[PDB]
């Protein structure tokens, strides 16, 4: 008779909640609560998740983590190189004296930046390899290029020299460190492809296009021939860009079965595709027939202006670096006796692996070659195991008691699909699911071909041999043909047919020199496990060779046949091995079945079923189905459901229905919710906040008691993922335990559709009140644009309706530009009963009389629907104009982080590797500390610097956007002179001057713009800016990096007062917030430097009240009588900078018109947010605003007596 209704509307980042107490039968009822919860994120995310572009902050954190991890692994490699080389006595005294080797193993001493090559004596720097430098300059003068070159070019000369000559040890250490710097591309799997693997980058010329006689789309397709004599595989339409074109391709050659090259083609562009540049550098290095270091040295010899790093060689296969470093080390080995002294080798071994005697024993057999390449430099870790993330069976469990005395359950991991045993399960399931039909009359022709167990067994022996089965094989097995019979499945679809066993049978047939009886079931399982488990190449052939040794099969073609196996497809079945093991014996029939393979419990249940006695674990439906199971012989060939029930006693997944009793269950459910359990973070956040809001309304309006919500209505308005999950979750509150309400969802949950909501809004006048609420924004726009095009008069309503000009009507929506529409939708959903949704979803009646009862009950006479009560519209107006919007906040600055790291610990007289938790305190910053771009400080005499600001200069490309003002913002004066000379030479047009062709022309003829004076080419210049940039850090060279605050990191805005009364404003950066929160203090200082006491601090999504000019709000409080005037003066912070704070009225979501620099108009000026109110007084918001605090439901929170009592009652 009286019903509590909760209407929920779910958006991308909005939850509209409304609770009403309806009595529809008497046309009575009243609203209780209304609100809209908003999760703030930029509209960039809104426009991105529809298409999808890395829309997750977790992914960005993962990317930074991976970059850092690579960095510290490179550092670790370097450290170990320092340790080993210091042991070998290879580092020079000047360098080695300032690496720590005792406490910080291999690290540099703090506040020192050593270079291996520049010895510093009395403040002067000197090069140490004078003689090799002399030899390199001798080489250049023999080549006749110059006699004056950089000293640090000696490394490539040494790398060439190291191949076939004796170099001193320090050069060799430098070379090893260089190799550690540049490691090269490498795929962990390997898996060498087709032996030819042509993949050859070639540049070809087209001779002629003979017209091929292939007429498509009314245009006749041409063919392509090349001068060196192949044909392009694909045809061509456009003739202009193919005739005598110097086109470059990557082609792949495969020797087909006929004995010819099946050549492919693919158009690629050099200097634009990574693969093309990689292959070109590969071929160009190989054709030189020399190591990459010597190749680089030769290219530097022939073109001394060549850019090596990033231009000449960017990325090459790791094989080149490996082979070059090898050749270097073997060649240097014969001359340096330290590379033969096994004492030193053992010393390095022990130093590097003190606590791992096993690894020491392994490496005591190797030498310095393997230790340097295979151990330190080129060591690539394997992928972490994902086995721990494998799913679990829903049936097999294990129970055990921990140290706490409790009893908890370990899961059993699901079966890999390629396992032969799941193969048996699956294809037996197919055997039972198999049935045949005739093509002529479509009758159930089976029970004539498969009626006895022998037919099943023979079909089994034929399928067991094959690898895939299809229409043809299935028909011809029975001697049937295509023309008369079919098999109830897709006529042209194939089904799996024990892939693993067939494939292994074929490969084992190819090896020969063995009898045709070696392959049995256990052998099949063991070899499958060998293939599935060891997925690493060298390990793979070692396991294969050992298997061929133990099993008396010749390892001659065994390993050759058994090397080329496609790795198993990564997929796992629904169930585990033990469960399927228990299942299969029951559905076995014939000779493969025997009673002894049924376990104890299923045998007992079989005896119980045949006996017909009464068991609590056997239901009546079982006997209903198992009436035919009279004898123990009847337990042959049972289907999946029968065998599953007999094994475990459940008729599939019957669910648990469940029913929550109080807010305790709910809050526990939220406490136990796991991250990343849904499609994407957006819907997960939406669902979690919906749950939280439901709990809050339950507590506030019903005190968490049973069945306080009589019914709940849900609506969404991609997003469909929420329509069913939230309904299933919320069924647990409104479900009835009487047995009437059963299913996936409670019958009380009534999802609707947009048709009902829009029709109710139009009929009941919610649209009219919505326009009346939103219109003043439109009059403000009209006044600001001094026009009348934003309001349109009408005479059917005799009033002004909001509107927009067509050229500002791109995607304007009058609902979308606010926040409370969510709550309005929630309200209009809640009052909609099941009868309304049934009527408006099944309006097709087939007879007017049958649905005429609903017509008369719900609609006025079929014109308009009856209101839920007489004062529905007025009450809805009163609520809608009295809703404050609650905005979720993320002020996470620091949080605690746990660090577990592997380490060898001494326990019970033995060292064991175990994880240790980090000692001391260590915080994790939860915001990006600054922006990526890094600038350096400069001091220019020819510019005036205001106090409190500095000049920072950054390198930028010289391009077409460089006009006189920007050219004057280039820090180099001579570059400015030359550049303005050039720009004058091109009639003052940077676009013509600074095109790549123009830049090239400037570079070639630099004399005729530098007054005839010589100068190096220019491509990038350091432009300087004047502003406030802070140091990134205080260690090493970090004190020279100047960065800018990151986006959305100005989170606190302090408002202070002096004893006289004036307000002072400040914005504290994230650095001081971090430091203060680390020292346990408040985020914002409570007094400024002037001693002014702090009113309070503001953060984005805060709420403030802006009092009228006449009101004197000093000890107002009494925030219970919030009326329309009071609530309309509520502003939400949006951003801050310096002493400026920008605000938007809390009911505004989107502006009527944004700001464009052309028209120079907008709803809230250029920033789309104001430092003042929108109303006519236009008062500084920050000078009179008072901060307020709301809860999830938008209810104000203020100090009261009871609160004051409880502050220290909780301590009492």
């Amino acid at each position: 008779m009286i019903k509590n209704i909760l209407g929920l509307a779910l958006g991308t980042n909005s939850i509209g909640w409304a609770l009403v107490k309806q009595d529809f039968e008497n046309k009575q009822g009243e609203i209780l609560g209304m609100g809209s919860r908003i999760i703030p994120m930029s509209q960039d995310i809104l426009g991105d998740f529809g298409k999808g572009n890395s829309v997750s902050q977790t992914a960005e954190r993962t990317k930074y983590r991976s970059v850092r991890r690579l960095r510290e692994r490179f550092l670790l490699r370097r450290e170990r190189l320092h340790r080993v080389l210091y042991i070998l006595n290879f580092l020079p005294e000047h360098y080695a004296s300032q690496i720590d080797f005792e406490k910080r193993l291999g690290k540099f001493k703090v506040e020192t930046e050593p270079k291996l090559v520049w010895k510093n004596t009395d403040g002067q720097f000197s090069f140490l390899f004078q003689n090799s430098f002399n030899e390199m300059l001798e080489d250049f003068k023999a080549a006749g290029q110059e006699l004056k070159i950089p000293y640090d070019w000696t490394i490539y000369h040494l790398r060439k020299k190291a191949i076939s000559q004796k170099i001193e040890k320090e050069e060799l250490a430098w070379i090893l460190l260089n190799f550690n710097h540049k490691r090269g591309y490498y795929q962990l799997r390997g898996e060498d492809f087709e032996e030819e693997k042509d993949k050859t980058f070639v540049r070809l010329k087209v001779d002629r296009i003979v017209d091929s006689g292939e007429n498509v789309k009314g245009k006749i397709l041409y063919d392509v021939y090349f001068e060196n004599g192949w044909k392009y595989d694909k045809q061509v339409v456009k003739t202009e860009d193919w005739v005598d074109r110097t086109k470059e391709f990557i082609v792949s050659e495969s020797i087909l079965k006929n004995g010819e090259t099946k050549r492919t083609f693919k158009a690629v562009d050099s200097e634009k595709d990574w693969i093309a540049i990689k292959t070109k550098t590969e071929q160009e290095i190989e054709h030189s027939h020399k190591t990459v270091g010597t190749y680089i040295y030769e290219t530097l010899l022939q073109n001394p202006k060549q850019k090596i790093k990033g231009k000449l060689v960017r990325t090459i296969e790791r094989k080149f670096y490996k082979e070059e470093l090898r050749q270097i080390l073997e060649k240097q080995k014969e001359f340096h006796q330290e590379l033969q002294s096994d004492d030193l080798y053992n010393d390095c071994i022990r130093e590097l692996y003190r606590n791992n005697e096993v690894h020491q024993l392994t490496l005591r057999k190797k030498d310095f070659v393997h230790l340097f390449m295979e151990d330190i430099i080129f060591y690539q870790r394997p992928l972490r195991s994902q086995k721990s993330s494998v799913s679990n069976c829903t049936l097999e469990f294990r129970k055990y008691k921990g140290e706490n005395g409790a009893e908890h359950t370990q899961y059993l991991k699901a079966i890999p699909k390629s396992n032969p045993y799941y193969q048996e399960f699956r294809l037996w399931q197919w055997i039972f699911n198999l049935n045949l039909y005739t093509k002529d009359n479509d009758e159930n022709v089976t029970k004539v071909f498969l009626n006895t167990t022998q037919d099943f067994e023979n079909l089994f022996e034929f399928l067991n041999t094959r690898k895939e089965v299809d229409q043809k094989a299935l028909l011809k097995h029975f001697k049937l043909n295509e023309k008369t019979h079919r098999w109830n499945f897709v006529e042209d679809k194939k089904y799996p047919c024990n892939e693993t066993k067939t494939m292994i049978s074929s490969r084992l047939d190819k090896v020969e020199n063995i009898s045709d009886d070696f392959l049995t079931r256990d052998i099949e399982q063991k070899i499958w496990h060998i293939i599935y488990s060891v997925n690493d190449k060298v390990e793979y052939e070692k396991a294969l060779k050992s298997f061929a040794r133990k099993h008396h099969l010749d390892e001659s073609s065994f390993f050759e046949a058994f090397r080329k196996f496609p790795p198993f497809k990564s997929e796992y079945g629904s169930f585990s091995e033990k469960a399927i093991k228990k299942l299969l014996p029951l559905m076995r029939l014939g000779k493969y079945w025997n009673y002894a393979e049924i376990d104890k419990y299923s045998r007992e249940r079989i005896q119980k079923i045949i006996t017909g006695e009464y068991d609590e674990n056997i239901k009546d439906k079982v006997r209903e189905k198992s009436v035919h199971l009279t004898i123990e012989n009847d337990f042959q060939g049972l289907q999946l459901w029968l065998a599953q029930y007999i094994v475990y006693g459940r008729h599939s997944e019957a669910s648990m229905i469940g029913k929550w009793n109080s807010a305790n269950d709910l809050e526990v459910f939220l406490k136990d919710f796991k991250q990343h359990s849904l499609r994407n973070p957006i819907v997960e956040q939406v669902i979690t906040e919906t749950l939280r809001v439901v709990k809050d309304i339950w507590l506030k309006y019903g005190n968490g008691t049973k069945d306080f919500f009589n019914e709940i209505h849900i609506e969404l308005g991609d997003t469909r993922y929420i329509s069913k999950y939230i309904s299933g979750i919320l069924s647990n509150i409104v479900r009835v335990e009487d047995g009437s309400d059963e299913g996936v969802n409670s019958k009380n949950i009534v999802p609707g559709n947009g048709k009902i909501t829009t029709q109710l809004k139009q009929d009941w006048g919610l649209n009219d009140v919505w326009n009346d609420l939103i219109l003043p924004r439109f009059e403000r726009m009209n006044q600001l644009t001094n026009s009348k095009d934003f309001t349109a008069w009408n005479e059917n309503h005799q009033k002004f309706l909001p509107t927009v000009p067509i050229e500002f009507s791109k995607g304007f929506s009058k609902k979308r530009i606010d926040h409370r529409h969510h709550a309005l939708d929630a309200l209009v959903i809640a009052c909609a009963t099941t009868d309304h949704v049934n009527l408006l979803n099944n309006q097709s009646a087939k007879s007017d009389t049958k649905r005429y009862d609903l017509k008369k009950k719900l609609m006025k006479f079929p014109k308009q629907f009856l209101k839920p009560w007489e004062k529905f519209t007025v009450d809805a107006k009163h609520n809608l104009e009295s809703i404050i919007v609650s905005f979720k906040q993320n002020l996470r600055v620091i949080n605690k982080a746990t660090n577990y790291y592997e380490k060898y610990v001494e326990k019970d007289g033995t060292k064991n590797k175990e994880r240790v938790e980090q000692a001391g305190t260590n915080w994790a910053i939860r915001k990006p500390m600054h922006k990526d771009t890094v600038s350096g400080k400069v001091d220019l005499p020819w510019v005036k610097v205001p106090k409190g600001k500095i000049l920072t200069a950054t390198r930028k490309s010289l391009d077409s956007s460089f006009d006189l003002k920007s050219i004057g913002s280039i820090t180099d004066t001579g570059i400015q002179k030359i550049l303005k000379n050039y720009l004058a030479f091109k009639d003052g047009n940077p676009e013509l001057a600074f095109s790549p062709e123009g830049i090239d022309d400037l570079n070639k003829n630099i004399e005729k713009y530098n007054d005839g004076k010589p100068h190096q080419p220019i491509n990038k210049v350091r432009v300087f800016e004047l502003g406030s940039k802070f140091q990134v850090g205080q260690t090493g060279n970090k004190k020279g990096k100047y960065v800018e605050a990151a986006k959305g990191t100005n989170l606190f805005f302090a408002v202070y007062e002096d004893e006289k009364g004036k307000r002072s404003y400040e914005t504290i950066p994230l650095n001081e917030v971090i430091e203060r929160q680390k020292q346990g203090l408040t985020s914002v200082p409570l007094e400024n430097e002037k001693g002014s006491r702090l009113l309070f601090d503001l953060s984005p999504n805060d709420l403030v009240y802006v009092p009228e000019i006449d009101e004197n709000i000093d000890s107002n409080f009494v925030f219970s009588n919030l009326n329309k005037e009071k609530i309309s003066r509520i502003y939400k912070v949006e951003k801050t900078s310096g002493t400026e704070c920008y605000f938007v009225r809390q009911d505004i979501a989107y502006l009527i018109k944004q700001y464009d620099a052309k028209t120079k108009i907008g709803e809230l000026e250029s920033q789309n947010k104001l430092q003042v109110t929108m109303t006519d007084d236009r008062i500084r918001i920050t000078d009179t605003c008072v901060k307020i605090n709301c809860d999830r439901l938008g209810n104000i929170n203020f100090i009261t007596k009871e609160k004051i009592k409880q502050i220290f009652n909780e301590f009492r």
């Binding site: 020292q1079 346990g1080 203090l1081 408040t1082 200082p1085 409570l1086 007094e1087």
Partner: protein, 134 residues
């Protein structure tokens, strides 16, 4: 080179003639204009008024004279309560001493002088307690 502070102990041993040596130590601890916390002055007033039963007028004269000419009062810091609570998790002193240390630290003091505070000890790697009478 280092902002040195003091506590009520230095003033109290300075005041008394019963131990000449400690009195001396204390007075040459005051010659260098050592900084001082307002809570130190409050406790000094409490002990003069309670233990010694001295008149209000003369102890107030002495306080004013010392603050004008002898010791440099340090402005009471507004974050003293939160910082003292922060030091409270890692340290176990009398809470009055913890407020003294908190206000000394928040004012950038490098060296503190006292007796009943476990000399030589480091407080949040910012300030160390030193017993000067030894």
């Amino acid at each position: 080179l280092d902002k040195i502070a003091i506590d009520t102990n230095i003033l109290l041993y300075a005041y008394d003639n019963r131990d000449l040596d400690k009195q001396d130590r204390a007075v040459e601890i005051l010659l260098k204009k050592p900084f001082v916390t307002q809570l130190v002055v409050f406790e000094f007033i409490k002990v003069l008024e309670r233990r010694f039963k001295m008149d209000k007028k003369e102890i107030t004269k002495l306080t004013i004279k010392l603050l004008k000419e002898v010791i440099i009062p340090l402005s009471l810091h507004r974050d003293i309560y939160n910082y003292s609570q922060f030091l409270l998790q890692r340290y176990n002193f009398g809470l009055s001493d913890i407020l003294v240390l908190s206000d000394s630290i928040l004012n950038n003091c490098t060296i503190l002088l006292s007796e009943d505070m476990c000399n030589g000890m480091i407080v949040d790697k910012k300030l160390k307690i030193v017993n000067p009478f030894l």
